[PDB]
Structure formats: C-alpha cells, structure tokens
A paper describes a structure:
CAs are zinc metal containing enzymes that catalyze the reversible hydration of CO2 and dehydration of bicarbonate. CAs are involved in many physiological and pathological processes including pH and CO2 homeostasis, respiration and transport of bicarbonate and CO2 in various metabolizing tissues and lungs, electrolyte secretion, CO2 fixation and biosynthetic reactions, bone resorption, calcification and tumorigenicity. Analysis of previously published structures of compounds bound to several CA isoforms, together with four newly solved crystal structures of CA II with compounds 1d, 2c, 4c, and CA XIII with 4c, revealed that all compounds bound to CAs in a similar mode but with significant differences that may be correlated to differences in the thermodynamics of binding. All compounds bound to CA by making a coordination bond between the sulfonamide nitrogen and protein Zn atom.
Numbering used by the authors: 4 to 261
Write the structure that this text describes.
C-alpha cells in the first residue's frame, strides 16, 4: 500500500494511481513574480465552531482531526469560492528535518510543516464523498508552520499523540478553536489542483495563506513518532509525509493581495 517510504512513496504513486501525472496536480511551487493579483477574489469568510471537533486518529499517513459535518456549523466562504464549503477534516504534513517539511514551496522556501483544512461543497453535493469527485467539490486551506515559540493550541494535539501511536488508533478530541489557530493575516494564493495523497483526485480549490504560524521544534518532532504501521506489524515511523511539487502545466496562480 502507498506511503512515503522508498518502495511505496510519491515517486511510485503513479504505479497505483495514474492521475499522479495529471494536469492539475498538487502541491506546487508558488513563484510570487508569476502570480496574478486578482481584484475579483474576496477575503476569506471563516466560521469554525470549537465543538465541531470530535476525534483525532492516526491514519498511517498523518493524524486526522475529524469534525462532525452533519450540518453547517463550521463553513468556509468567500475567497475564490462560489457557495458554502463545510469543514470536514484537519491534518498535517512534515519532513524529517525542520527546514524542509511543507508541501507548497514559495520561491524555493519550504516551511517546517503545512496544515491542511479540508472542506466540501454542500451547496451542490449531498456528501463529501460525492464532492470529492468533482472539480468544484473540495476547498483546502493550507497554513504553513515555521519553528518558533511553542503553540498552545497545537500542544493540545501533541498531548494526544502517545495515545494514537499505532496506525488506526483514535481518541476523543473536542473544543478545538481552529479559528484562533489561523495567522493574523489571511492574505492568500489560490489555484485549481488536487488531493496531495492517493487517490490524487483533481477536485480541490487550493487556498494557501502567505503568513505562517509558529510551532516549537519539540512539538513538531512529536509527530514523527507516529507509526505508519498497525499494531502487530513490524514498526516503521512516519518521519516524513510530504509530496514534492508537481508541474503547474499552464494553470494560473492568483493572489488576493498586492
Ligand atoms: C478529508 C477526508 C475525510 C474522509 O473521511 N476520507 C478522506 S479520503 C482522504 C482525502 O480525501 C483527502 C486527503 C488529503 C487531502 S489534501 N493532503 O489536504 O490534498 C484531501 Cl483535499 C483529501 N478524506
Ligand atoms: Zn494534506
């Protein structure tokens, strides 16, 4: 099965999922002199209910905070989006070293990690599952992490990781104030792309915030202790789980600011 190890990592994914070589793949290099300022883009309209968070799990590929998306308590609107995108899931990407952990790269600068906040278009689709197969179905907010002072909201996640070390394990997790976790500035870049993991579907409107948030080196290192392997399998650690940048193939990256 797919992963980030030598045999099963990003270079080999095209072997099980050919769209890995598609024309709208993510992540990408963001080259700021090539981005087009677009005055029709709107500021982000963000509403996240801290009670929406319910469970945190180890998928084998990252941790997932899953949100109750039964109704429209936590939604993203504005930005490049038409209509209302419902919060589903938060997860993180990192690398084995603090200087190279993010998926999107900005003029060659990788960050220490990158948080993804995944939402789905419930104004057009009846479920996440249906939305995930259409070009306008998903919207992902990408937030960079840089090493700095410890982050008291991320401490809440790190404190759970010992209880979910094995692939498949879950624990309850709620009262998570995702709105306060975001950086001061919500200036962003946006482009049409894909999931950055298999099945790599080309259904995502990416919204990548320019300003990073801080995490300490000790908090970040805790994520690398997660196993990519299940209880009863030979242990291997998820030291790195970021996909390299993919060809832009003529897509327009736009900025909400200039
Ligand atoms: C978000 C979610 C909930 C769920 O129940 N199942 C799944 S399958 C994984 C998936 O669809 C997915 C994974 C990664 C991403 S990412 N790395 O943020 O481009 C996305 Cl948009 C979607 N994903
Ligand atoms: Zn992701």
């Amino acid at each position: 099965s797919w992963g980030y190890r030598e045999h099963n990592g990003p270079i080999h994914w095209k072997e099980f999922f050919p769209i890995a070589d598609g024309d709208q793949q993510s992540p990408i290099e963001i080259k700021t002199k090539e981005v087009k300022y677009d005055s029709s883009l709107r500021p982000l309209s963000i509403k996240y209910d801290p009670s929406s968070a319910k469970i945190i799990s180890n998928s084998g590929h990252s941790f997932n905070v899953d949100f109750d998306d039964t109704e429209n308590k936590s939604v993203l609107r504005g930005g490049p989006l038409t209509g209302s995108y419902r919060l589903r899931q938060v997860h993180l990407h990192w690398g084995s070293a603090d200087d190279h952990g993010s998926e999107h790269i900005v003029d060659g600068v990788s960050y220490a990690a990158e948080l993804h906040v995944v939402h789905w278009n419930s104004d057009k689709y009846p479920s996440f599952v249906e939305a995930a197969h259409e070009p306008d179905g998903l919207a992902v907010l990408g937030v960079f992490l840089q090493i700095g002072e410890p982050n008291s909201q991320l401490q809440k996640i790190t404190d759970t990781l010992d209880s979910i070390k094995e692939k498949g394990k879950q624990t309850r997790f709620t009262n998570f104030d995702l709105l306060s976790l975001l950086p001061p500035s919500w200036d962003y870049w946006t482009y049409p792309g894909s999931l950055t993991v298999p099945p790599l579907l080309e259904s995502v409107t990416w919204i990548v915030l320019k300003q990073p948030i801080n995490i300490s080196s000790q908090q970040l290192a805790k994520f690398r202790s997660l196993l990519c392997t299940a209880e009863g399998e030979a242990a291997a650690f998820l030291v790195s789980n970021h996909r390299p940048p993919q060809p832009l193939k003529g897509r327009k990256v736009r900025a909400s600011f200039h």
